[PDB]
């Protein structure tokens, strides 16, 4: 009987069963549902870890080990959480890249909501990482938190405020546990709002050309395409959990607390590398953090810089080359962000930083304009 009339299943039907979708959406389109799976994944394992973790300075590092050694299967649950956080970023990255390449950002509202979803998960992962009170957890917590101190005039009252003291201590570990528990529920609401705005127009596709003449039902097609792709997300997640639990995980969080001693070479998680390089590039306190913020906050300027008469980059050889130069540049930032602030590296790191911004703020838009002229448009 009917899916269409019931006030509840009607939502389901309109979102996952009868929703008209482009016959041609690619694998690149699988990431949104994978981001949903990621969020649920983080939520379940996250929760079971909360049934055993304790938020006090003393027993924090210890309770986590209690989980990995004592609590039945805590190790598998703990690793799925950690590796799930990485996958979540892997997915954010692909998802945001897919939107750039294919012009999807032209759906203003849904793209703007996405940026919010990006910042929310970054906020979430940060608080998360601090939780086990390891060396990197602590020093990473110290670095990132201090960014706020750069803000003129009110900078220090703010860090101390967010600290609940004179430095990252007791009060901060507890509040971070709290905010880290509620954030993913708030994320979940923003994501439903994301999905609402998207349905208003439906999905874009590889060609950037309207698909209203060739829509297919989300259900049999994307239902199975999404299943298959979930299993791929799962294989990749398990491989990590079950063969390489410590691979992305820094060895220093396996050593408790040292507010007195900063490790020789503190290294961000992975997904912060490129942004870490940008912040570091410029030898200035204020300007570094400003460059850092702008490095992410730039996504919301992207739509103003669309210059081409076409939506997607599928028929745009110039933009394509510049897009990959962007990716290749990010990969350079990543490499550099994980390296000591020295000779070859600072200069490479400064040139990659101007390139990132140079290509988004100027190169891409100029390619679009010459592609238009080349076509006589």
């Amino acid at each position: 009987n009917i899916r269409k009339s019931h006030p509840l299943m009607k939502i389901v039907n309109n979102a996952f069963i009868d929703l008209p979708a482009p016959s041609n959406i690619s694998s690149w389109w699988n990431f949104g549902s994978l981001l949903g799976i990621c969020l649920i994944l983080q939520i379940l394992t996250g929760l079971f870890l909360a049934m055993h973790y304790t938020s006090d300075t003393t027993t924090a590092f210890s309770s986590v080990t209690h989980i990995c050694r004592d609590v039945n299967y805590g190790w598998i649950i703990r690793y799925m959480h950690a590796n799930g956080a990485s996958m979540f970023f892997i997915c954010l990255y692909m998802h945001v890249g897919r939107g750039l390449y294919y012009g999807s950002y032209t759906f203003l509202e849904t793209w703007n909501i996405g940026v919010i979803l990006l910042l929310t998960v970054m906020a979430t992962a940060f608080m998360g990482y601090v939780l086990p009170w390891g060396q990197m957890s602590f020093w990473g917590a110290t670095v990132i938190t201090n960014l706020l101190s750069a803000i003129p005039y009110i900078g220090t009252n703010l860090v101390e405020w967010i600290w609940g003291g004179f430095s990252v201590d007791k009060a901060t570990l507890t509040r971070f546990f709290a905010f880290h528990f509620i954030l993913p529920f708030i994320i979940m609401a923003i994501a439903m709002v994301h999905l609402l705005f998207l349905h208003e127009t439906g999905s874009n596709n590889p060609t950037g050309i309207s698909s209203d003449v060739d829509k297919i039902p989300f259900h049999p097609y994307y239902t199975i395409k999404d299943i298959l792709g979930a299993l791929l997300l799962i294989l990749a997640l398990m491989l990590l959990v079950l063969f390489a639990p410590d691979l992305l995980g820094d060895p220093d969080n396996y050593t408790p607390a040292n507010p007195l001693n900063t490790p020789p070479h503190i290294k961000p998680e992975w997904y912060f590398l490129f942004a870490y390089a940008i912040l570091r590039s410029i030898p200035n306190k204020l300007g570094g953090v400003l460059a850092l913020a702008f490095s992410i906050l730039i996504l919301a300027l992207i739509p103003l810089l669309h210059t081409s008469k076409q939506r997607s980059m599928m028929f745009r050889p110039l933009s394509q080359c510049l897009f990959w130069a962007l990716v290749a540049d990010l990969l350079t930032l990543t490499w550099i962000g994980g390296q000591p602030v020295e000779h070859p590296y600072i200069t490479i790191g400064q040139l990659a930083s101007v390139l990132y911004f140079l290509l988004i703020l100027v190169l891409m838009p100029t390619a679009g304009t010459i592609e238009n002229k080349l076509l006589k448009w």
Binding site: N14, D18, L19, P20, H199, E200, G202, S210, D212, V213, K215, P217, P317, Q320, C321, W324, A325, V327, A328, D329, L331, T332, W335, Q339, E342, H343, P344, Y345, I348
Partner: protein
């Protein structure tokens, strides 16, 4: 949202199709697929590949300089 029946106007196109239980799910998987991937590869290498070798070259050089410059170094201090 939008519903089938209210999307857009289409006139004059016929679509012929088969039942899944009547066709193969992998017909010429290799016979036609391999050629196809070679072809999509050719079509995109020139745009995708170059920026990455550019990073690759800077990656090996960059680390090379790093090692030779600092550590390996202590070059001449002769007396």
């Amino acid at each position: 949202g939008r519903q089938f029946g209210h999307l857009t106007r289409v006139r004059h196109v016929i679509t012929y199709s088969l039942s899944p239980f009547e066709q193969r799910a992998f017909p010429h998987y290799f016979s036609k697929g391999i050629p196809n991937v070679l072809r999509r590869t050719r079509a995109c290498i020139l745009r995708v590949a170059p920026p990455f070798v550019a990073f690759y070259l800077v990656y090996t050089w960059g680390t090379q300089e790093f090692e030779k410059s600092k550590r390996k170094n202590p070059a001449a201090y002769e007396n």
